[PDB]
Assembly symmetry: D2
Homo-oligomer: 268 residues x 4
């Protein structure tokens, strides 16, 4: 086709039609991929959201903190894709940090229970998904997670940044595992995307200073980006994930591709 013609790809992390995973899924479908989707807690909602995708995809429940969901995932996917068949692609687009780890709520006041939850979902689950899914991936396969660059501290994202640092680190280790399968594991570091949760935050859900910082981060991003950054458009990030899902970056693993407008390559 079709960048992804005839690849079977699992895509997690659709929750709204503004989810980065929603766009990745749409772009993957436009590109010939046959999807299986996961979806966390509100599966009726996600089913309804994902009905709007160019094509039908079976939707499986996966709460990444649920050991049983992870244990059964894979059997459930091979059931969805047919017993002879394996996955070519896996998209991790899962993230969460309790808002204590995120606010104008001081960095220091996030209880470990909360940061731990955040890291479980946002970092450890990348290894979890890979563990569940590598047994049902084809050689030449590709696992992609969603990242943002946590190299430098920043306002507001707080423990979520730490979670991303941990994720990038996890990604290099899953690369080692994925490699024994002929599978690549990479992260896409996106710039900020006005996802519903993000709009809620710039809109003041987590306090005014958190919103103000974030708005500041967004403007600076587009300014630093040599090709600009449009936070209202997930598609350049969806496409980048698809590029990683494709056979066109075959020698790249344990790695991070920056779909951020080049902002991170630029101080000012």
């Amino acid at each position: 086709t079709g960048l992804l013609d005839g690849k079977r790809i699992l895509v997690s992390g659709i929750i709204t039609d503004s989810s980065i995973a929603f766009h990745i899924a749409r772009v993957a479908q436009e590109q010939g991929a046959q999807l299986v989707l996961t979806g966390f807690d509100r599966l009726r909602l996600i089913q309804r959201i994902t009905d709007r995708l160019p094509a039908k995809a079976p939707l499986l429940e996966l709460d990444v903190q649920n050991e049983e969901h992870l244990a059964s995932l894979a059997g459930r996917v091979t059931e969805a894709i047919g017993a002879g068949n394996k996955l070519d692609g896996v998209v991790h687009a899962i993230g969460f940090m309790p808002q204590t780890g995120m606010g104008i709520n001081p960095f220091f006041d996030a209880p470990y229970a909360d940061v731990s939850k955040g890291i479980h979902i946002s970092a450890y689950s990348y290894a979890s998904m890979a563990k569940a899914l590598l047994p049902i991936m084809n050689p030449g396969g590709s696992i992609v997670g969603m990242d943002f660059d946590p190299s430098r501290a920043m306002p507001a994202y707080n423990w979520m940044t730490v979670a991303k640092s941990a994720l990038e680190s996890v990604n290099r280790f899953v690369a080692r595992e994925a490699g024994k399968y002929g599978v690549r594991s990479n992260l896409v570091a996106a710039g900020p995307i006005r996802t519903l949760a993000m709009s809620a935050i710039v809109g003041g859900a987590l306090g005014e200073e958190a919103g103000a910082q974030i708005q500041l981060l967004e403007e600076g991003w587009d300014q630093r980006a040599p090709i600009g950054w449009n936070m209202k458009d997930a598609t350049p990030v969806a496409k980048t994930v698809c590029a990683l899902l494709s056979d066109w970056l075959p020698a790249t693993t344990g790695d991070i591709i920056y779909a951020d407008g080049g902002a991170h390559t630029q101080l000012l």
Copy 2:
């Protein structure tokens, strides 16, 4: 004196006389610092170990996973150092990863409960200690944590590497907090040191392949290091921590100083 003449410095993480913190404490004492030590669970043992230090230091209990130890730490330190007095320096030299996160035990088989424990102790506690201690630190003060470079995946260290990635990320955030106090926060990335736990590992405590990898990592380190690396000597790392504790790196925060022989600057 005395690099650290008249600085009050808290040093955590002494457990044996081969602890990096033991050397840091010794070097800090030789350098004029007045120490308060923390010590986790075996305080009789640590007291006996620390008796061998050039000078007396009060030893306080601090289990970094214990909220109450953290809540009372600070009052306990100002009690140890005298009500008029604040800390100039804090050494975090705390690390742990349950051995499921460390073995030939596959990376994928570490339960999150265990990696979470590891991250609590090895990463989050850096923010914990800083939160507890910044209220009782002087402007010009310095928080230093022990790191190793988690930029690239490696054999055996597994989730502990992820924990370090998370720590480095935490360190940049505590820098932001520490800065409001005039306090620096930095990490020292050491090369491998034949600490008791490390010797136990190269000796096969965590399986033979884990020991073999680790021994390999050690030899390659000294080979890559343009000035060599002696894993039996913590003192160049103790000295580096002291350099960070001193006023001689006054414009360095949120940062990592590599006391690793320059190995990380060298591919081969």
Copy 3:
């Protein structure tokens, strides 16, 4: 088509049929691109080499140290591609370092005249080519240079590594310029490829220790690479350049994509 269907792409740096640029050109042609090739000094040779490409491409002379070649390049390319037409893609695959900057010839003994020549060709020419070609590139266009990771020093590559460090730095600046055109500028950091010059070096052209180091670097690469590294195969690198030439990494500029088997993400 065709990852690159209907893109006009200039590809420099073909000198043998084992040139990375040769493979990039072949892969680009297989992918629907219409090429213009440049070629430095031995144009009869290059023409004969490039005859073996899936398709015809006009071959233009470009000595990147020749101001006049650069001044006329662009007019010559629009002549080759037709007056209405612009470039969508530019491949810099040019490198050279006089062997004084490369040997067992001590790092210190390379005269500046030689390292300067190397940097002119290997780094500065990336800005040169971009300067010449950006006026005749389409929005959505892509400039790609060939890199190897110079983050850490290494044996044998010496001043060539410095040249790559300078190149990566140049690349971030050309990104800033390229961006005003809607053009991306990125580098591909390849692992070692047994190009004729490289085989000559491991074979002892530059002394035995240089060959031995290099062979060592190669073996370690494939070992560190979670998906392996085949130094006899440029195609995963050709494909990665094509991925950058494509519209599939639209939010990536000033950046470096590692087509190296993930080796750089791995210490050991």
Copy 4:
């Protein structure tokens, strides 16, 4: 004493009393070091400037582009420090980029002759000085160069940033050489310092947009720096160089210490 008590240290790069090298020299003298200074072209001027140093230091001429100055340097230094004696420390604080490589003068318009000059002086000379001086350095010795972080492109500094990227790369290679002598080689990445040339630039010497960018870079620096950044104060950078010159960072080579207020650890 005296961080640097009884160390013989060569310090290059004094040109005004606002030179970073001037402060390094002053701080080194306050710290017990016995200096030899180099000085490029205006030696009467430099002698007069350096008379203001806490102590006398012999001033030697060293034009780093002059092969003969480099060939004779070392004999001239051992003459200045006495035949039995070697250097413990070498400070490279040399930089220059012709203003074509620096302006609102487009990045693309800097002729290679000029960038080459800049790199000769700003990067290659680090290897030059090390080559000249390592034969007359003691084991445990320390070479330190002045850097600024060229990881990300920035406005105005243009080719000078490329020069720094090349310098950092050179530094890792001189580490390899320096190591055979027991000598460390490290760079200090300073934040912006209102040196005479820098004030001239923010004041509009190189065009208004270059000044405006630079002023912007300065303000953002102090904002990002968790401990702030005072561009009018070189002393935290002088002290950091001294820390590297000292025995207190004995396991750090091929490395870069950021004396920048922690700004580089912080996105915003």
